[PDB]
A paper describes a structure:
Two Zn ions are located in the central cavity of the αβ-barrel structure. Although no exogenous metal ions were added to the CpsIadA protein solution during purification or crystallization, two strong electron densities were identified in the Fo-Fc map. We performed an X-ray fluorescence scan using the crystal to determine the identity of the metal. The result showed that a strong fluorescence signal was detected near the zinc K absorption edge and that the emission peaks from this scan were unambiguously characteristic for zinc. The CpsIadA active site contains two Zn ions (ZN1 and ZN2) with the ions being separated by 3.2 Å in distance. ZN2 interacts with the OE1 atom of Glu166, the ND1 atom of His205, and the NE2 atom of His234. Notably, Glu166 directly interacts with the Zn ions in the CpsIadA structure. The antiparallel β14 and β15 strands are located near the metal binding site and appear to form the gate for substrate entry or product release because of the relatively high B-factors observed in this region. In the crystal structure of the ligand-free CpsIadA, this part of the β14 and β15 region (residues 297–312) was disordered. The final model of ligand-free CpsIadA had an Rwork and an Rfree of 16.3% and 20.1%, respectively.
Residue numbers in the entry:
A (entry chain A), B (entry chain B): 6 to 296, 313 to 395
The structure:
Amino acid sequence: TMLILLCNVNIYAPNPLGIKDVLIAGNKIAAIYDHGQGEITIPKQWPVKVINFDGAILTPGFIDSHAHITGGGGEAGFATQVPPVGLTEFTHAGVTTVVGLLGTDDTTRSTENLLSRVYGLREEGLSAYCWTGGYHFPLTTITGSAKSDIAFLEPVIGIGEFAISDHRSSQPTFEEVIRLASETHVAGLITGKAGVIHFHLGDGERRLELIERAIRETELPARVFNPTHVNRNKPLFEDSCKLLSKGCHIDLTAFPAGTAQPGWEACDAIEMAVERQLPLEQITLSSDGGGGRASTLGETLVATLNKGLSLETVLPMLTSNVANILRFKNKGQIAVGFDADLLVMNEKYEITDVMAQGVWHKQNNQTMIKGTFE
Amino acid sequence: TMLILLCNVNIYAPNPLGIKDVLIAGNKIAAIYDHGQGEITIPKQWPVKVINFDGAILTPGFIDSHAHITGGGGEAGFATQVPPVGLTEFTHAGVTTVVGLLGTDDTTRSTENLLSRVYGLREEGLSAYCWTGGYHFPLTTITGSAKSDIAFLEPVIGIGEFAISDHRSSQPTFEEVIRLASETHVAGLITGKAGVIHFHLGDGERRLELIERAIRETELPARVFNPTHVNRNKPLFEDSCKLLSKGCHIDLTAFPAGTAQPGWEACDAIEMAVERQLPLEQITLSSDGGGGRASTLGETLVATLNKGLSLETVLPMLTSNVANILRFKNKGQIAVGFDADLLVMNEKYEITDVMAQGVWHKQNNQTMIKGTFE
Ligand SMILES: [Zn+2]
Ligand SMILES: [Zn+2]
Ligand SMILES: [Zn+2]
Ligand SMILES: [Zn+2]
């Protein structure tokens, strides 16, 4: 039914509001107000469903800016192509918005594949967007240019994951990179969309040089440049922390626990950023799912809380911080007028309930909706 | 506010429902129920606006399937290119959904212009779609084929307005036409969209021969072939009425009252269809606005009600019959779950209030929203 009243929820918006009741109307958050119960009169003719959550934590849904929705892989032979990621692999991990991309294999996979799968996820109830262009130069696009792709394909928000400082990159020049950045930036103005270039970083010692030079030498705003994997090695993390001062958002990768290799686990990188007093609103977390599994997002969250960080310190990294850089004006907050994408968590931060666009995909820890072929 | 309660409305859905109360929740119709005498208590914390209409007629918004949103013209020199049609030219005529197209001038105007303007009108709060391809062959498209424009550009729903039996046509062959129809039909299957070819008819004596042949000789469903301007001359209208038996929707043009003269005024054609016991669900009316003004849709409606036809007979031709052929599953009806696209009319059938996606564009005879540059 179309109106859902969520009573007695302890809201992290991500900022803590305390105990509230929330009215959902269709796919939107319509009201948030101090908790009552028996003293409210609901008209009998209105289709309202009332759920009492007994003070459970409610958070916005996670926005995963980096997922290989078509499947990634292929770097160890053709048998290593990962199949497309099922709906429930996102929704059950608390992901209510996904941004898809191609990675190393933009030779056998196409943007048509990517965008098709965005529409398919949208048809199944998930919010979904994608990055055009891919990993290599020349770019992989539908229309022949990034500029035209971002302008005319509504779900295309920018260029990604474009590779720098990696043995698998195209060895892009400074001139190539700043031209791509101009394209996405301008397309963002034309469209109101993110207008960012999301960079895959490898383990090359040149690290962020290209981005540092772009911001120092050119007029392109620093927010256009969005490096990911920045916790993959320690010198790179250190340089990424410095780049915050310029105004970039940086994206950590939620590596499977015990896998962060010679870099930092994401929970440790976040602990470091907190201690250092870095601008936390500029830091985000993504899964690399399909490339990775989206459940590492919540695992990283719980590992952080386990260190003694507060939910409101870390939760923006999965929600409002992502929506700010990606210009998703209606996502990432539990606030009136925003989309009804929300999670309920129990006291050990397991996600028990998942709502996407006002529809339950998981409720009382049970699957309500699964993908067509799951 | 995000909930609006429309009280004491006489609903034509288009089917007559009698007097009701209607709850709008964001952009959707959430409840429709019997108008009682006692005012109901609405919880004070919920942002609900209540509005009383004293029994006024409420209808779905008009869906205009044929408008030159960029402007048309150009057929008498370059100074005849019409400027883009303002937002209010649609809303104030009761048009809450428009489908744009290019016409004779697909040489100086592009699908990029068209689709840009679709997104513009959506940003201003109109629902808007477009036809790709245009008038001539080879087609005008963004991606270089209709099939790929329909598959990957969300707002693109089919091919139009493709000219047959007209001195300005490309003199298309049967093989050309059926291949186009194949493209749009399959793209409709892939996407769920209309998957139709909307044909501009001229005054050529060959009339609908190419369509008739396609239906007779091939497996293409009749609903694929959607001729417009079928009232423009009398023999064409006679042939278009026969095409209803094959299962095609046919589209009448709401010519300005002075002016249909070799053919039939749209109100006279509608009256003939009713009298002749034709399948009225298969007949639509569009404005050719920009090409033409959307206010002729209302004018036609009023002219047919003055002949003594009923509002429930004619109103589907502006609303549900259009939604049916174009596969707009959430438009065209005042029913729970459909989009909150609604008109209120006075007893002279003048449009006093216009709601698009739950937002008022006209209220009590006053403009509430205008276009950016109107
Ligand atoms: Zn990567
Ligand atoms: Zn990746
Ligand atoms: Zn025409
Ligand atoms: Zn026209």
